[PDB]
Design a protein around this ligand. Sequence first.
Ligand SMILES: [Fe+3]
Ligand SMILES: [Fe+3]
Lengths: 221, 221
Amino acid sequence: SFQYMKDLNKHIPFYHIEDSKFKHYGKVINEYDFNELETYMDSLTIPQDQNVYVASVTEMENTIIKNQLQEAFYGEMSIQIGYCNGPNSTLNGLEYHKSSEINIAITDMVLLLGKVQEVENNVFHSNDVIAFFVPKGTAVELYSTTLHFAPCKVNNEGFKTIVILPKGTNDPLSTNIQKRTKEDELLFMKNKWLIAHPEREQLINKGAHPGIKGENIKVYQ
Amino acid sequence: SFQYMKDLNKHIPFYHIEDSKFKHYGKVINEYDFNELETYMDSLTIPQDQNVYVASVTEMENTIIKNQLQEAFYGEMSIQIGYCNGPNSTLNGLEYHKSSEINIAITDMVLLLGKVQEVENNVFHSNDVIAFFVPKGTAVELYSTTLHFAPCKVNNEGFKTIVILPKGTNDPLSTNIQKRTKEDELLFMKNKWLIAHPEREQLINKGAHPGIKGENIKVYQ
Ligand SMILES: [Fe+3]
Ligand SMILES: [Fe+3]
């Protein structure tokens, strides 16, 4: 429940995804159903140790709805459908893509969002983050200029999310560039620029840029 | 010259592209060399009747700069390089992509920009447009949430721009979708959503949505 989560998280701006404060970050998508996907997602368990992210799942890609979303929402550009399920409750990191991402909440979840415009010399401040409570069943477009990461759990068992992007996004980089722009320092996976919190050893050890300044926010439930 | 243009366009909030007001719309790209493309552009004159947009030019794509922009600025996503040159001086339309576009000003030019978030039931108002004077040699990223169209001229002979996007963008739609979202009404080419001004009969005739309210803004020079 939203009010329970709201009450417990007075240390961060906290909104329902249907609130107009979301409008700068994304849009709620209403006119699609996702039965084919939900059927797949129900065959999956939530890991309790750490989040899993599969970028591209054939089963979910071989669907009517994938073809609908590709031709219309993505204007005929090739897409992948994956999932991010897990027990996480902290910010950890903030990433962007030069694309639209769809997140479909298969469980209640929360997203910690920023705006890429608020990055200055590869630094973003926790204070700028906003949380949005997304109910089971809700689908959102997150804009390319919206800093985002893995959801934070609402229910004790964790969360389940469908994640839709241009095909190839989050694949390993296949070249090692000559870095020349500020942004190049963030480049981490295909079509994925990442700003990690310095207390997130799992990302820092992977080479991620340590540019979140402030507390690694925690979402209490 | 910027002050010349500014003095003639007091009917429109008018800014240098280096101004901070641009930060909401895009970013200036500095650390790249576009010389190979500049050389191709020198082989062209400016059309005098009407704009020309060619989405993909193989010769421009078979360059070192194309490989660099693909691997780094687009994070390994496949890109096309084209150009948009001509004599235009009006708004005419506002389009977006679920991608970043790069515009490289080979001549002085002006961009009339909006935000996608300012669209309300498939309507944008001219009064929300902001003009940005882009000097010869400036490269800009336009974010996916930035409504944009073809440049407006500074010099009497017209303008020349390089246009970089994900490969396929602005190709003809291969499907006729069953429309279901407000956004589906705007879908006009591959990865291109357009809101046309009603005075451009040629766009409306082709099925563009007439949703710009207000003057077809003109840039005087
Ligand atoms: Fe993402
Ligand atoms: Fe465009």
